[PDB]
């Protein structure tokens, strides 16, 4: 069963005595129904919808990396509402292993 990543005590040792757990808000913000402008036409309302996607949002950490909107299933990865053609570039499921080959390295 999965119980999280394994931690060695050495990795829990801080580099400063004042280090605490970063208090970054992971609430993306306040939202509601997407509100279109009357002036916008069909094309410009499409752009508006594409700019309100929660799955394109993320939270930036103190070191500049961002934790993205994540989901257990790929159903939450398409634009909402679903466009006619979704996964043009095949979504990549990344598997990890310990195998390596020499060609990838240089001395």
């Amino acid at each position: 069963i999965y119980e999280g990543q394994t931690v060695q005590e050495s990795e829990l040792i801080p580099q400063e005595d004042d280090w605490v757990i970063e208090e970054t808000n992971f609430c993306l913000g306040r939202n509601c129904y997407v509100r279109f402008r009357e002036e916008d036409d069909l094309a410009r309302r499409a752009l508006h919808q594409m700019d309100s996607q929660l799955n394109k949002m993320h939270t930036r950490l103190r070191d500049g990396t961002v934790i993205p909107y994540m989901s257990f299933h790929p159903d939450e990865m398409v634009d909402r509402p679903a466009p006619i053609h979704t996964f043009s570039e095949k979504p990549l499921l990344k598997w990890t292993w310990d195998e390596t080959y020499e060609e990838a390295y240089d001395d």
Binding site: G4, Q5, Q15, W19, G64
Partner: protein, 49 residues
């Protein structure tokens, strides 16, 4: 022979020098989050079962 890819030629996502100096801190937070997660699993499993 196989084609060669050079990681040194890849443009990187923008990160300030201040942010780059905090990498160890963020890793440290991640380990403590995994430690707290794993312990809580045992605690909760005992309580609810």
């Amino acid at each position: 022979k196989p084609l060669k890819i050079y990681r040194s030629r890849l443009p990187l996502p923008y990160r300030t020098d201040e942010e780059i100096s905090q990498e160890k801190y963020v890793n440290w937070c991640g380990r403590w989050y995994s430690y707290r997660q794993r312990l809580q699993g045992d605690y909760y499993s005992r309580h609810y079962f």
